[PDB]
């Protein structure tokens, strides 16, 4: 590669040396893509190597098999596993594709051409070339739209996707008539992120999922064609910084928001993250506790509408701050929960009293019992329960692992966005090295600060 | 000066402040632990405690802390202090509703 | 302790404030 005297960047910033080296930059990117595909294949095969047919996938520390099963591979009615060969095929295809991408990354990193400008003008670029920057953005936008449409095709004609909201415990269903209504699609986007609305995390049906994917795929392809055939406007040119590190900073802020959103999706959403495969959410486990303690005490011959707590509020049933009937206890804070095991018992007034007394189902009762016994509560040792509990159960929820890891990654990537936004602005300005010591700006400003 | 309103302008006083802050903090903590060596606690506020005894409706975070401290003492004494031979039965230990 | 505390707090404000304000007015009076 190079040394510090020919680049000015030390080894702890050695990748910065290849900011202007387009070929080595491309090789580092595709070698990284090989790493991502390699981890996906390696972890997927490791997970199917550590898979037990009896226990569900949330008890065994699985985070990729629930994704594949949500897509509708190897699962049937209720979420039991029919075969693991789709998971094995996914893992193997990922490993071999990672081998190919790693060959390419090693090739451009070691013996690939230094710069792609003098010989392959389609691929070589300078960072201040706004036309070709938008061209590459359009290529990648077309690729993203094609991926979104691949999910749409999978949901429409390639076996369907897993629905937890279908009757009988949920199953793999073929999506028919997705919600292409623009108001329904963008009301999620314009929605508030807070309780009761949850921004886009509160998408709660596969019709909305696949309709939103139709919209994102079509808009992404349209934006790709638009970016390939246009050049940025002067107001955008004035508004932006047009260096490679600036483009990196923009990407970092974007994927940081994406990581925080994925944290909230894993922690709250149960239709894109079906509770059979990922375990119960926090609200789900609390409502499950209150639900099964309702039905146990009903079967022990007690009244549920009566028997207020020590506070005079209602041990089993109270009213939410808007009026409809919700489960008693501190689980009132999770009154916003909506699951497939509460909806057949929930009507216009919230929890229906006669339906809750009479129309219990065995699968709902077992699901509530298990969503009590496997709550997203655990330690770093993977010891289940609260921090005061025994070392007897080996369980930490995949929801807990995903939410924690992706909040950490989202936070550092926001901080990396700060670092790169500041350094890109300072490098465009001439400040990346320090103050000039003879043209210091503060010395040209009046005193009194 | 433009971000915070006040700023250092003497390097020597800046570094003496960087020296002064942790030393004064640790010395004050040392003096407080010396007070605690003789059980001279700042455990209670007499006015707020008598108000909370003469009013059930008075509830504050400080009173919650006092209750939590009673819980800590009574749930930790038996296993931490074997010399007292404190065989407190499960009967008399402080405990809230459920849990 | 509701009046004794008040006079203790008032003393502990005023006396060191008086001392420091002696020293500051003295210092600033020398330009």
């Amino acid at each position: 590669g190079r040394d510090q005297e020919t680049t000015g960047f030390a080894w702890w910033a050695g990748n910065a040396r290849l900011i202007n080296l387009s070929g080595k930059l491309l090789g580092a990117h595709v070698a990284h893509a090989g790493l991502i595909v390699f981890w996906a294949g390696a972890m997927n095969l490791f997970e199917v190597s550590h898979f037990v047919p009896e226990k569900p996938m949330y008890e065994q520390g699985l985070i990729l098999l629930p994704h594949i099963a949500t897509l509708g591979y190897g699962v049937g009615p209720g979420g039991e596993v029919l075969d693991t060969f789709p998971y094995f095929v996914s893992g193997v295809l990922h490993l071999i594709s990672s081998a190919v991408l790693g060959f390419g990354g090693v090739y451009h990193s070691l013996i690939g051409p230094e710069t792609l400008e003098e010989s392959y003008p389609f691929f070589g670029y300078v960072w201040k070339d706004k036309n070709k920057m938008t061209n590459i953005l359009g290529y990648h936008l077309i690729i993203l739209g094609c991926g979104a449409w691949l999910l749409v095709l999978k949901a429409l004609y390639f076996g369907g996707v897993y629905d937890t909201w279908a009757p009988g415990g949920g199953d793999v269903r073929i999506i028919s008539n997705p919600t292409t209504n623009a108001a329904i699609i963008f009301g999620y986007i314009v929605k508030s992120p807070f309780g009761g609305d949850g921004w886009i995390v509160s998408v709660d049906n596969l019709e909305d999922i696949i309709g939103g994917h139709i919209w994102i795929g079509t808009l992404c392809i349209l934006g790709g064609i638009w970016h390939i055939y246009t050049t940025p406007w002067p107001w955008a040119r004035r508004a932006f910084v047009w260096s490679g590190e600036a483009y990196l900073s923009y990407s970092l802020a974007a994927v940081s928001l994406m990581g925080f959103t994925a944290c909230c999706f894993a922690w709250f959403n149960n239709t894109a993250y079906p509770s059979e495969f990922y375990g119960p959410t926090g609200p789900e486990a609390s409502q499950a506790q209150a639900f099964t303690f309702l039905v146990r005490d009903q079967r022990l011959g007690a009244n549920v509408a009566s028997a207020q707590g020590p506070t005079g509020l209602g041990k089993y049933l109270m009213r939410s701050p808007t009026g409809e009937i919700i489960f008693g206890g501190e689980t009132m804070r999770f009154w916003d929960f909506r699951g497939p095991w509460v909806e057949p018992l929930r009507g216009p007034s919230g929890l229906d009293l006669v339906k809750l007394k009479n129309d219990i189902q065995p699968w709902q009762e077992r699901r509530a019992a298990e969503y009590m016994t496997h709550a997203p509560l655990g330690s770093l040792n993977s010891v289940g329960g609260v921090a005061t509990e025994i070392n007897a159960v080996n369980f930490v929820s995949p929801r807990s692992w995903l939410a924690t890891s992706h909040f950490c990654l989202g936070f550092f990537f926001f901080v990396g966005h700060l670092w790169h936004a500041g350094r890109a602005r300072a490098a465009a300005a001439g400040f990346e090295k320090g103050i000039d010591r003879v043209d210091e700006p503060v010395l040209s400003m009046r005193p009194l600060d | 000066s433009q971000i915070f309103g006040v700023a250092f302008s003497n390097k020597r006083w800046l570094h003496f402040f960087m020296l002064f802050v942790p030393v004064t903090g640790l010395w004050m903590s040392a003096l407080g632990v010396v007070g605690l060596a003789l059980n001279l606690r700042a455990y209670d506020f007499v006015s707020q405690e008598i108000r909370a005894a003469e009013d059930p409706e008075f509830e504050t975070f400080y009173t919650k802390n006092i209750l939590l401290n009673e819980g800590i003492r009574a749930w930790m004494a038996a296993q931490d202090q074997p010399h007292e031979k404190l065989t407190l039965p499960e009967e008399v230990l402080p405990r809230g509703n459920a849990l | 302790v509701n009046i004794l505390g008040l006079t203790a707090t008032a003393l502990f404000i005023i006396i060191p404030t008086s001392f420091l304000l002696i020293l500051y007015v003295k210092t600033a009076a020398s330009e």
Binding site: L443, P447, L448 | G5, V6, S9, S47 | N2, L6, T9, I13
Partner: peptide, 30 residues
């Protein structure tokens, strides 16, 4: 009677903060 004292002490600290921000000794370049 005590809330009077606490309020006075708090606004006194805030007043000293205000005076320290906007009424400091101006530093000189020399």
């Amino acid at each position: 009677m005590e809330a009077l004292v606490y309020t006075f002490l708090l606004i006194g600290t805030l007043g000293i903060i205000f005076f320290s921000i906007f009424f400091r000794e101006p530093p000189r370049i020399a």
